[PDB]
Design a binder for this molecule. Structure first.
Ligand SMILES: Nc1nc2c(ncn2[C@@H]2O[C@H](COP(=O)(O)OP(=O)(O)O)[C@@H](O)[C@H]2O)c(=O)[nH]1
Ligand SMILES: [Mg+2]
Lengths: 182, 269
């Protein structure tokens, strides 16, 4: 016979090259891609156990660019939760959380929970990356900094993760799910 | 093979869509699927003649005129994705290929086709309920194809402009000695009858000719160094900008002059 289960829609946004597309791949295939990385991940829906009852998790990747700006809006309808991603080693991606992504989502999805995701957690303690940024008066975003951004945009949870090491990765999606079951 | 008869079979087909358009009946899956056919037909025809350049142009026109009309008609369940996807997959096989300047028009047409499926499919979306994930997934695949393709097409036209440019530097420079050299060579060719002594005589004739153009010996070495590769790149195809094959053939004539004179000594002395 059949039984019902929860089906949840999830939409990921954020500046180009913050790691959106890799996050999704690494999570759903347990493999960070070598070369070739589509702009937007093939639309794709995952069954995840949570507290003993399975849940269907529809992952909608996005981009922005120029074709991609007419496209992104079409993902928003009926969204249950949305992740706003930015790169921990790109303060400009951080600024667009307040400036761009937060307002865009609240426009299209009033009342839907938002998680803020700081990405590329592995690169924060990488001296190559840190030196490059020192070389132009920049430094990584810290936790209390991201946590405060999350507080200010009314995000339900702030989470750091690294698609490459998978370090925070599974937590991000568990919390995304959890935020929808209240 | 694409014959003329086939081509007008295909043209009467488009005209049919153009009328259904005129009277608000256009089968949009019909016309998009059929257009894909036109593109492969026109592609095949372009690269084995059999069809005269008169029709090829009017067929191209008629295609574009259909695209036109589709764009104007859009302002006023996965059904489309189902019909239109084959076209994207075929066009996707062009991207992984290697391109020459004869391919320009083919790619301009493919681009217009993706441009058009995109505008049509986003329009049906922006109004027709939320979009399915299959269609969203297609849409993005379309946008990635269109931008990769724009990037190659721009590389190709950018490269061609610089061949046009190189061509006319070399044509302009040649002509310091085009004149002297052509005429020298004409005199040399017109006079030439074996034995020891015949060999000395032909040697002498060549030495005279080399002298006549001795002010350019150097220039003509350097010219063929510059111009032979350009000619290999531009190749011998009938299918490119008309002015460009003109300039191209002008450069081949110039190059055969220099190359004769650059060879003359090791050939006859
Ligand atoms: N070092 C590192 N690089 C990453 C990580 N995630 C993504 N990247 C790199 O960031 C670039 C952008 O990745 P992508 O996921 O396509 O960016 P997107 O436009 O936001 O989806 C690529 O070169 C990735 O390899 C990560 O966790 N660690
Ligand atoms: Mg991407």
């Amino acid at each position: 016979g059949s039984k019902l289960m929860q089906a949840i829609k999830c939409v990921v946004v954020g500046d180009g090259a913050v790691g959106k597309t890799c996050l999704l791949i690494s999570y759903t295939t347990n493999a960070f891609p070598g070369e070739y990385i589509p702009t937007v991940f093939d639309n794709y829906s995952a069954n995840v156990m949570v507290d003993g009852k399975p849940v269907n998790l529809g992952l909608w990747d996005t981009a922005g660019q120029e074709d991609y700006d007419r496209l992104r809006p079409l993902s928003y309808p009926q969204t249950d939760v949305s992740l706003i991603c930015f790169s921990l080693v790109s303060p400009a991606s951080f600024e667009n959380v307040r400036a761009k992504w937060y307002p865009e989502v609240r426009h299209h999805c009033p009342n839907t929970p938002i998680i803020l995701v700081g990405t590329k957690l592995d690169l924060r303690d990488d001296k190559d990356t840190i030196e490059k940024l020192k070389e132009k008066k920049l430094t990584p975003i810290t936790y209390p900094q991201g946590l405060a951004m999350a507080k200010e945009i009314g995000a339900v949870k702030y989470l750091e993760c690294s698609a490459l090491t998978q370090r925070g990765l599974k937590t991000v999606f568990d919390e995304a799910i959890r935020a929808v079951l209240c | 093979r694409i014959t003329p008869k086939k081509l007008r079979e295909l043209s009467d087909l488009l005209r049919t869509h153009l009328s259904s358009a005129a009277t608000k009946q256009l089968d949009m899956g019909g016309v998009l699927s059929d257009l894909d056919t036109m593109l492969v037909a026109l592609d095949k025809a372009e690269r084995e003649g059999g069809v005269d350049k008169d029709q090829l142009k009017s067929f191209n026109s008629l295609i574009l005129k259909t695209y036109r009309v589709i764009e104007d008609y859009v302002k006023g369940s996965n059904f489309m994705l189902s019909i239109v996807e084959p076209s994207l997959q075929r066009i996707q096989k062009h991207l992984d290929q290697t391109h020459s300047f004869s391919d320009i028009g083919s790619l301009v047409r493919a681009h217009k086709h993706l441009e058009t499926l995109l505008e049509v499919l986003v329009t049906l979306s922006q109004q027709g309920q939320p979009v399915s994930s299959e269609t969203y997934g297609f849409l993005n695949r379309l946008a990635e194809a269109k931008i990769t393709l724009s990037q190659q097409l721009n590389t190709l036209q950018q490269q061609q402009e610089s061949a046009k440019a190189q061509l006319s530097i070399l044509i302009n420079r040649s002509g310091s000695w085009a004149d002297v050299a052509r005429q020298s060579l004409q005199r040399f060719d017109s006079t030439r009858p074996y034995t020891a002594i015949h060999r000395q005589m032909m040697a002498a004739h060549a030495a005279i000719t080399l002298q006549e153009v001795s002010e350019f010996t150097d220039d003509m070495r350097n010219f063929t160094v510059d111009s032979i590769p350009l000619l290999i790149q531009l190749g011998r195809s009938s299918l490119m900008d008309e002015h460009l094959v003109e300039q191209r053939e002008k450069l081949r004539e110039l190059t055969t002059i220099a190359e004769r004179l650059n060879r003359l000594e090791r050939e006859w002395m």
